[PDB]
Amino acid sequence: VNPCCYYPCQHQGICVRFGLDRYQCDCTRTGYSGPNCTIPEIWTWLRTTLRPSPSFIHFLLTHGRWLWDFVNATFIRDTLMRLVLTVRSNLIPSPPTYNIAHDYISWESFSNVSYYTRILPSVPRDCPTPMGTKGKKQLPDAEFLSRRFLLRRKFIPDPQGTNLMFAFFAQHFTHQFFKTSGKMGPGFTKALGHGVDLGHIYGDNLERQYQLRLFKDGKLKYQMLNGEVYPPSVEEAPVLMHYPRGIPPQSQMAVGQEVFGLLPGLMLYATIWLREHNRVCDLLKAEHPTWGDEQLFQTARLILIGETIKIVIEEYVQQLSGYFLQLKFDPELLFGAQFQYRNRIAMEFNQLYHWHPLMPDSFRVGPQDYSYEQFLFNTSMLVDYGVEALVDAFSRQPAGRIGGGRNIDHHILHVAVDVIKESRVLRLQPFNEYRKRFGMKPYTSFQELTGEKEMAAELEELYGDIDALEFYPGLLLEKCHPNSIFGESMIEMGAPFSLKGLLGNPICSPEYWKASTFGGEVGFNLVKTATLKKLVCLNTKTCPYVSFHVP
Amino acid sequence: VNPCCYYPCQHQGICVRFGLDRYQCDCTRTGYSGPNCTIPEIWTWLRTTLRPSPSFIHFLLTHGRWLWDFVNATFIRDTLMRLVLTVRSNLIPSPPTYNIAHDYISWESFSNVSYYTRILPSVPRDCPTPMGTKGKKQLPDAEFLSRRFLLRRKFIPDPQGTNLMFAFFAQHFTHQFFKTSGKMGPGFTKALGHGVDLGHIYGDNLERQYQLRLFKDGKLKYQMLNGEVYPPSVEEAPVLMHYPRGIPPQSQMAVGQEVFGLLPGLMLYATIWLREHNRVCDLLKAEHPTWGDEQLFQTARLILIGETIKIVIEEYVQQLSGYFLQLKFDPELLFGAQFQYRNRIAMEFNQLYHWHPLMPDSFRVGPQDYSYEQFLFNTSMLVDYGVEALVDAFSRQPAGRIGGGRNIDHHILHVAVDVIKESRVLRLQPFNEYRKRFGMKPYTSFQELTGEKEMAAELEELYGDIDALEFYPGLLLEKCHPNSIFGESMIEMGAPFSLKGLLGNPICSPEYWKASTFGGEVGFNLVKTATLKKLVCLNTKTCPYVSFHVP
Ligand code: HEM
Ligand code: HEM
Ligand SMILES: CCCCCCCCO[C@@H]1O[C@H](CO)[C@@H](O)[C@H](O)[C@H]1O
Ligand SMILES: CCCCCCCCO[C@@H]1O[C@H](CO)[C@@H](O)[C@H](O)[C@H]1O
Ligand SMILES: CCCCCCCCO[C@@H]1O[C@H](CO)[C@@H](O)[C@H](O)[C@H]1O
Ligand SMILES: CCCOc1ccc(CC(=O)O)cc1Cl
Ligand SMILES: CCCOc1ccc(CC(=O)O)cc1Cl
């Protein structure tokens, strides 16, 4: 059999086929040597034996508030943040490596941004089993697997107090870089840009952008409804939007991310950010009476890109992490480091971010309780209630726990089933192999994975070997940290993808991170002091309860 | 008047318009402060008062051969190459900054690779004069300027011994990253890739590449003639090639760069590299019998990119510099440095690279002497003589001196005329402003620029002021170093663009610079030991005199 099917090469070593049946591991710069890159160098050895486990660090970071407050007020905050940023980031290859067509480095893979990249090469097509060498010749029925371990029975709230405001931000935010192409197939994205470029607000292509712009004062087109500002209709902004046949254009809003009409939650943020852009335009014009529409537009976009990163690191991730350490967004922390300011979305990162357990059984707005059939394509909810009302509602309703299993509402369970099926098409390597790729020891049994016995026994019977457990199912079934939203894998595997994506942005480079880039001191401060509360309230008639945490 | 027309900000400070008539300079990280970034910080002052002049370092590098022979044999060689690589590179913005549409940082300028980038922004369209503030309301007639100062009268050979083998290499090589879009206009390129991607061999788009590929053994299509290997015909590889109307497809050669059929010298190199790609494929298959066509092709491509960068630094640039220091291509030299492995072609680099003075009065091949009329669209010379014969001839014929003036053959003088006109459309800033941006003191007069008085006087009368002198004319009229091919500006401005262009390629990054990237140790050595002599002679029946220097 093909030797690489055994994943012989350890610690990021590269398996290459030589001759008709041999293989070799390129252990270059892995910190190890030997046939499979297992013989540790002196510093490699010290580092791995002195490194406390993920569980222990997580414990340190969620205990001793008093000590953390003291630390957050010192330069240590800067030391630890830079540490998190660099260590977390070094786990992501930059420039990118493989894609769905090349399980090896190639010029096509480096230049062709229509491909998602991947961290581990696919499971070779000629391996004994679908997962490589372990498990059964046939994987568990995707739908049965989902109905048995992911379907929600009783709604489980997130112990960390995460609300729907956070849940919709996450969806809205990620859909600017997760845009799998239906015509091209799995492993392909339309989200060229591969990151926080705000394409979900300005469009992922120029012509779409243009149809969305006013071309006056650098602003975005809009319409007034009830004396409030909302994205324009597809009639004033002839842009492709995905709405069910039978809905008139005069009821379809145009936003840049064609799929946003599918949820009031998504169109809410589309509205909020649109209002913020035009607001920033007004501020720039006061400072620069000589500027034209283009410069105003471009500069506001850079500012909004900055605000988003600021808000994602300091509030979004802060809420997710649960850390007592006050995370900080400051590009300077990396100026003395070796870091590439480029980013490429990975298919694994896409899989990992399918956080459907967050959605509730129904959507409570005031005393009214809306069902999925009343929420999904409602093109009038947003305008009926307005921004303040929905923000207050979503900020008050608790979202579901992500990890732990059995927590995805039946209405959207089909999404999980399809993620599992796509994983097999993409031939994603086993969960334990990804565990290793991110610094963890593989699980030695299902009972070790879940913190229990019943599910474990049933998973063991279906998969046959813990080494056959798949990527996505692994993330969602792994036991959660104490009172956390998900397990360690989600953190240890997602932190690297996230942070590299936030800081590996051109505006974070020494060349771009200057006040001139944002129109001056005033534009720069909008980025440096951006807040979820200001994003909403500086754009609404009244200020509601706004937060990523339930009250 | 627009205050920025005075180019008030120094040392890379960014001029920004504020209010109705004010301006401010963003001196962030320039090493200076004050309204125009002219008040140095203590260290900035030490560094600039200790830095010897460009003419001095040039001197130290072109003297004391004895001394350099020991240096090149020790780690000092590396220490210096790194020093050159980093200091030269830091003068090039990365990520890129402005483009023909935006004289300011923008997401569109960063994401849109159809635009050439630019180092200095354009002269604001609302300035008193075309160059900003100095000179006459109208610039000298491009053709007049060309006839008077760039037209050849008597062939001036390159004192450094450069031959036509070098000239044609330079043309072949650069036309892979210099491909101005006729349909889109100046400031636009079709050579996405922006660097050494070998698109002039494989094509600048996938479909062209697919039409050029054999899809067997990862090889490129070809045809046999006189028992020799040449590029296929357009009838066998249906690709758009620019040939005079009337030449049927059966008689065209398909190569990657549509414009190459227009010169035997160009198609010569197209032939050599084609034979090299297919040769490398053979070596690869021997090593990896289990590989398919895709991986053989891709890996072969990466190896050629490496060879190209290798030969360009160690032989090409060595020839140009005339340094006693032996330049070295070793990506590891920057592994400890802060370097961005990306590159974006600048319009200035395009202009600067117009080295038409290199071309002779005619092309001698054996006892025969061909004229431009016989050379330019000759569709049989390459095959009539074959690779070896032409290489021998081109390696023996001297090329013209680039700098000094009056040395462009009348047959191609029109390129220079249009180059100057494009410059005014691109609104390139004055030569002196570029001298500064690249670390040199501006010229205080035309007599200082030229090393004489005759041309200096005529130039002064035409331009009126030294500060009105345009980019390209400045480069070609500047007094040349002793027995050099061109002036110091050509080096001080070209070096940063070149070196950044060579090392700012993903294959030179830690993630790619591994043996596995090139199919193993064998592939990695083809790159590490690449040579002009080997590039020719390992793909020809006999080995002729091959070199960038005349015998
Ligand atoms: C009303 C609740 C939601 C519904 C109805 C929904 C529906 C969908 C659907 C239909 C797809 C494509 C499915 C397919 O092709 O089979 C999808 C993809 C996805 N969803 Fe959701 N989703 C919801 C909430 C969320 C949330 C809260 C997140 C968390 C960030 C999320 C993240 C994703 C991601 C990352 C993808 C894949 C992106 C891509 O490749 O284009 N979804 N969702
Ligand atoms: C018989 C010899 C040559 C001929 C007939 C020739 C002809 C041309 C022509 C017709 C153009 C485009 C002119 C226009 O649009 O007005 C051009 C552009 C150019 N040539 Fe040459 N050339 C020759 C040799 C060279 C050499 C030796 C070099 C040095 C590397 C060179 C570098 C360039 C560059 C950099 C451009 C601009 C590229 C672009 O923007 O696409 N040329 N040449
Ligand atoms: C001074 C401290 C010494 C600690 C001893 C560590 C020894 C590491 O030993 C290594 O373990 C790997 C996994 O079992 C093997 O694959 C390697 O071949 C082996 O050398
Ligand atoms: C208490 C101080 C905490 C500093 C934060 C360290 C940054 C997080 O570091 C992470 O630790 C994990 C556990 O060992 C590793 O598996 C990850 O690869 C590493 O990036
Ligand atoms: C003998 C030691 C040689 C060291 C090589 C230095 C690399 C060349 O360095 C160059 O020097 C010029 C003159 O000061 C500067 O104007 C350029 O910006 C700089 O890149
Ligand atoms: C996809 C979700 C991203 O989640 C995270 C990103 C970063 C950190 C902080 C760290 O430990 O480095 C924590 C979490 Cl949970
Ligand atoms: C214009 C073409 C490029 O020319 C050069 C590039 C690099 C170097 C070496 C150095 O940095 O000094 C010298 C020359 Cl002439």
From Swiss-Prot, chains A, B:
UniProt-reported outcome of changing residue 353 to F: Abolishes cyclooxygenase activity
Entry superkingdom: Eukaryota
Location of the protein in the cell: Endoplasmic reticulum membrane; Microsome membrane
Record note on quaternary structure: Homodimer.
GO biological process, one term: response to oxidative stress
A GO CC annotation given for this chain: endoplasmic reticulum membrane
Pathway entry: Lipid metabolism; prostaglandin biosynthesis
Alphabetized UniProt keyword annotations: Dioxygenase, Disulfide bond, EGF-like domain, Endoplasmic reticulum, Fatty acid biosynthesis, Fatty acid metabolism, Glycoprotein, Heme, Iron, Lipid biosynthesis, Lipid metabolism, Membrane, Metal-binding, Microsome, Oxidoreductase, Peroxidase, Prostaglandin biosynthesis, Prostaglandin metabolism, Signal, Transmembrane, Transmembrane helix
EC number: 1.14.99.1
Name of the protein: Prostaglandin G/H synthase 1
Membrane topology listed for this record: Multi-pass membrane protein
Glycosylated residues, chain numbering: 36, 112, 378
Pfam families: An_peroxidase
Function: Dual cyclooxygenase and peroxidase that plays an important role in the biosynthesis pathway of prostanoids, a class of C20 oxylipins mainly derived from arachidonate ((5Z,8Z,11Z,14Z)-eicosatetraenoate, AA, C20:4(n-6)), with a particular role in the inflammatory response. The cyclooxygenase activity oxygenates AA to the hydroperoxy endoperoxide prostaglandin G2 (PGG2), and the peroxidase activity reduces PGG2 to the hydroxy endoperoxide prostaglandin H2 (PGH2), the precursor of all 2-series prostaglandins and thromboxanes.
Cofactor note: Binds 1 heme b (iron(II)-protoporphyrin IX) group per subunit.
The species this protein was found in: Ovis aries
Annotated site, Aspirin-acetylated serine, chain positions: 498
Recorded family membership: Belongs to the prostaglandin G/H synthase family.
Record's keyword annotation contains Membrane: yes
